[PDB]
């Protein structure tokens, strides 16, 4: 996942503070992954988790990814001193706050759905839990 | 602005070949204007393969 355009190529780091206020409830499916701590979730990790969910359920069901990695992060070349201009973008990041719902899942069977979401959670650099649409 | 801008515009006379005659004021044509067809004579204002085979044979 990569945005097609960005208005600003190099940006400040997104701020890691506060509880999430939007997208904190399951809205598209029956089961979801809710974040319990701040972190920078990468498109690599997102694709890893999506593939884990799909290969566990193997068929049927629908998976929603309601975050997008559009905030870029830069990096200087390897062996360089400090301060000769900002580096070029090299990561794409979603800014995740506690309470945010990361993935959503619909599937008939409780146990398989929960196992698939646990598969996904073990790929993310966050403590997360599984929640349901009541 | 009307000083020397618009062309002449004075009474004329339309006469048609059929005979329908009226008069308005037109441009440079000095007096009478003679026309061949008008709204009072022109058409549209006044109104088989097997058949051909058999009429041939």
């Amino acid at each position: 996942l990569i945005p097609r355009k960005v208005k600003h190529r190099k940006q400040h780091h997104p701020r890691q503070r506060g509880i999430a206020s939007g997208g904190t409830t399951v809205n598209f499916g029956d089961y979801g992954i809710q974040a319990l701590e701040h972190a920078y979730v990468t498109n690599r990790q997102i694709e890893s988790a999506r593939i884990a969910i799909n290969r566990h359920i193997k068929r049927g069901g629908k998976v929603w990814i309601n975050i997008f990695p559009d905030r870029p992060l830069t990096k200087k070349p390897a062996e360089t001193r400090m301060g000769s201009g900002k580096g070029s973008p090299e990561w794409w990041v979603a800014n995740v706050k506690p309470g945010r719902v990361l993935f959503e899942l619909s599937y008939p069977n409780e146990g398989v759905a929960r196992a698939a979401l646990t598969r996904a959670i073990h790929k993310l650099p966050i403590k997360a839990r599984i929640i349901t649409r009541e | 602005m009307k000083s020397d801008i618009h062309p002449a515009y004075e009474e004329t006379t339309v006469v048609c070949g059929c005979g329908n005659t009226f008069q308005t004021r037109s441009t440079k044509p000095g007096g009478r204007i003679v026309v061949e067809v008008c709204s009072q004579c022109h058409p549209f204002y006044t109104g088989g393969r097997v058949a051909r085979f058999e009429k041939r044979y």
Partner: protein, 178 residues
């Protein structure tokens, strides 16, 4: 004292009232203005419209038309903003009545292969538009004294509120539909 105007005021005003149940005489439709423009294209090319359009629209109508200039620029037409591209005149009043008469009576029938103007070319509010292609049927111009031929299109603006009302008004005025 335009005969088409008196025929209108004498029969058309109450014929239209009989047709559409106008409870007020102010509601009766009428033609307010007639607009003619050439819409020349040789703006970037040869830059001549001073006589190609002005010196004959004067002859067709009776008043000098206005020269229109492009509002923006288009590369696919070599059009650059601010240069003469169209010539328009606005007939209104007894001159408009006389032009309508002179058109419908002796000009419009003279069109070669004329079979009747379409009745579907109304705008949707009551205003009618149609086009020509040459310095023909207007007897005022002479083909012996013209450059390249060019057409025009005419807008007949009416106070009618609907296309059927406008069509009835023009049919009464003498526009041959089909």
């Amino acid at each position: 004292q335009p005969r088409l105007k008196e025929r209108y005021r004498s029969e058309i005003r109450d014929a239209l009232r009989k047709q559409f149940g106008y409870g007020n005489v102010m509601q009766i439709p009428t033609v307010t203005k007639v607009v003619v423009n050439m819409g020349v294209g040789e703006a970037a090319r040869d830059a001549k419209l001073i006589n190609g359009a002005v010196n004959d629209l004067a002859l067709i109508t009776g008043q000098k038309p206005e020269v229109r200039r492009a509002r923006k620029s288009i590369a696919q037409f070599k059009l650059r903003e601010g240069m003469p591209v169209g010539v328009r005149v606005t007939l209104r009043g007894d001159r408009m009545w006389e032009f309508l008469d002179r058109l419908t009576s002796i000009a419009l029938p003279r069109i070669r292969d004329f079979r009747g103007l379409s009745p579907k070319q109304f705008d949707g509010v009551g205003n009618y538009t149609f086009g020509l292609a040459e310095q023909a049927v207007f007897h005022e111009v002479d083909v012996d004294k013209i450059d390249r031929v060019r057409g025009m299109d005419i807008n007949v603006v009416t106070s009618a509120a609907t296309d059927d009302e406008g069509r009835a008004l023009l049919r009464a005025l003498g526009f041959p539909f089909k």
